[PDB]
Amino acid sequence: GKKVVARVAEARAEDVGKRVVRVDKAERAKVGVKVGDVVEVKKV
Amino acid sequence: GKKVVARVAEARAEDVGKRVVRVDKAERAKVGVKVGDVVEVKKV
């Protein structure tokens, strides 16, 4: 299966309407990431 | 390693300033996802 290498970012005003995966504070604590960290996005 | 189960969403105006992973059209084609699809986010 293919996957996307990406970085946690702070959504910008120009990002409205664009496709994103939201990662809230609790989810970030679980994964152990802060803004700027590299993550992998995989299709389920 | 822990991972987050999430869904591709359309960023809202209230999402500005919040942490997201941006997935553009090309990236979505690679992963094979559309808005509404379940994905897994893993820390690298």
Numbering used by the authors:
A (entry chain A), B (entry chain A): 5 to 48
Could you share sentences copied from the article?
Here, we study fold transition between distinct β-barrels by protein engineering and structural biology technique. Here, we discover that the previously reconstructed ancient DPBB sequence could also adopt a β-barrel fold named Double-Zeta β-barrel (DZBB), as a metamorphic protein. The DZBB fold is not found in any modern protein, although its structure shares similarities with RIFT and OB.
Interestingly, we could not solve its structure by molecular replacement using the DPBB fold as a model, implying that design-1 had adopted a different conformation in the third type of crystal. Surprisingly, they both adopted into a unique β-barrel fold that topologically differs from DPBB and RIFT. Compared to the homo-dimeric DPBB fold, the directions of the β2- and β2’-strands were inverted, resulting in all anti-parallel strand patterns like those in RIFT. However, the 1st loop connecting β1– β2 was rolled up, unlike the simple β-turn in RIFT. As this loop configuration resembles the letter “Zeta” in the topological scheme, we named this β-barrel fold the Double-Zeta β-barrel (DZBB). Design-1 exhibited the metamorphic property, adapting two different folds, DPBB and DZBB.
